[PDB]
Design a protein around this ligand. Structure first.
Ligand SMILES: [Cl-]
Ligand SMILES: [Cl-]
Lengths: 211, 202
């Protein structure tokens, strides 16, 4: 199989800027490569075909270049609809293979997260399971490290994070990290801490409570 | 114009089977190559199969070969995807697409969900206070709808995307930043025909 390697994983840019996305084939794909734009809730749309030919219904601002193993995508003066995910595809051989995607996100200033912790509700404890929710509100960049400590013991395998899309108004992210415990295990401990690490924070902030 | 009309997908058990389709028009379908592309939640685009217009030959990804069959009916301009021995990782949005490589025309995404979970309405727990919210936990399948005070409270609301838990059930939290009035979260689950209203108290 031909591996298609897209770089960088994320691109942080402003509207009106010209931008270039890279795609690398593990072996020669000649010029048989295509580019796609994908916005959530709507079907992906074609931009470039034959590595450099702009597709029939694609806007004038999309250009493509390269051959063999290194391909590029240029978006001249990018619009708000351009803040999406871009995939390159090789169709030179079988299987057809896509690249893993490049997310073009809205650049903005650094903002530190407002951290909040929520103990499990009394009604949830009536059902043999506990949920400790940690909220990281309206921060930038997306990159955030969330550590869960139960009586100073680091937690592994019992947490899941969920992060929102960039806020249409302020271009920030919000993240929930939810810790799952049995009612039994929740009653064995006192200190539930959510320690956060972010570029906007000089030192890690810890939001905690006692059972 | 080139039109591609998708069928409904479905909810299937592992080892189960489904057939999805697209009715084509606005082009010479009998001689055109047709493909299937899928996208799994949080993953990228992946090519599934292609049927060749000129001779009816077919190509598959290794992950689906022997389980999935791409076929067509020239008389009705129908392209099909018969997905047998369904696996959890087949859970995705499936797009019928025009040509074998230059995908200019896409059908709407057809959702296929592969899971052993039974349909189940959520349990709505409060996130008590500033910030407050609701924990919409243990539901199946997606989606749920979360609104605040019957849709009056729209600003400062962060309704998180659902995560699939280890239990195979979904979960999300809806949060709201408010000043210093009653706060009710209204969560609907159409698959289970359940509506839950939960007020958040400090
Ligand atoms: Cl343009
Ligand atoms: Cl959902």
């Amino acid at each position: 199989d031909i591996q298609m390697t897209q770089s960088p994983a994320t691109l942080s840019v402003s509207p009106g800027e010209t931008v270039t996305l890279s795609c690398r084939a593990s072996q020669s794909v000649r010029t048989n490569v295509a580019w796609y734009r994908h916005k959530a809730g709507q079907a992906p749309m074609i931009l470039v075909s034959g590595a450099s030919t702009r597709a029939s219904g694609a806007p004038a601002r999309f250009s493509g270049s390269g051959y063999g193993t290194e391909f590029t995508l240029t978006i001249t003066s990018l619009q708000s609809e351009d803040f999406a995910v871009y995939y390159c595809l090789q169709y030179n051989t079988w299987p057809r293979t896509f690249g893993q995607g490049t997310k073009v996100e809205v650049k903005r200033t650094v903002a530190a997260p407002s951290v909040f912790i929520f103990p499990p509700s009394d009604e949830q404890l009536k059902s043999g399971t506990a949920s400790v929710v940690c909220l990281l509100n309206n921060f930038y960049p997306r990159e955030a490290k969330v550590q869960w400590k139960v009586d100073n013991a680091l937690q592994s395998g019992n947490s899941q994070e969920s992060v929102t899309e960039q806020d249409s108004k302020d271009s920030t992210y919000s993240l929930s990290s939810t810790l799952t415990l049995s009612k039994a295990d929740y009653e064995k401990h006192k200190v539930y801490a959510c320690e956060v690490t972010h570029q906007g924070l000089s030192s890690p902030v810890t939001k905690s409570f006692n059972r | 114009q080139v039109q591609l009309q998708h069928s409904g997908g479905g909810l299937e058990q592992p080892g189960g089977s489904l057939r999805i389709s697209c009715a084509a028009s606005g082009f010479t379908f009998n001689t055109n190559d047709m493909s299937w592309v899928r996208q799994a939640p949080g993953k990228g685009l992946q090519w599934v199969s292609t049927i060749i217009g000129i001779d009816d030959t077919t190509h598959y990804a290794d992950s689906v070969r022997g389980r999935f069959t791409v076929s067509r009916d020239t008389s009705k301009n129908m392209v099909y995807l018969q997905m047998n021995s369904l696996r959890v990782e087949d859970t995705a949005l499936y797009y019928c697409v025009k040509n074998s490589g230059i995908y200019s025309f896409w059908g709407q995404g057809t959702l296929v969900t592969v899971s052993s979970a039974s349909t189940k309405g959520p349990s709505v727990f409060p996130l008590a206070p500033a910030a407050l919210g609701c924990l919409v936990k243990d539901y199946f399948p997606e989606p749920v709808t979360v609104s605040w005070n019957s849709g009056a409270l729209t600003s400062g609301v962060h309704t998180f995307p659902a995560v699939l838990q280890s239990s195979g059930l979904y979960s999300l939290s809806s949060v709201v930043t408010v000043p210093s009035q009653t706060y009710i979260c209204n969560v609907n689950h159409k698959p289970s025909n359940t509506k839950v209203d939960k007020k958040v108290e400090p």
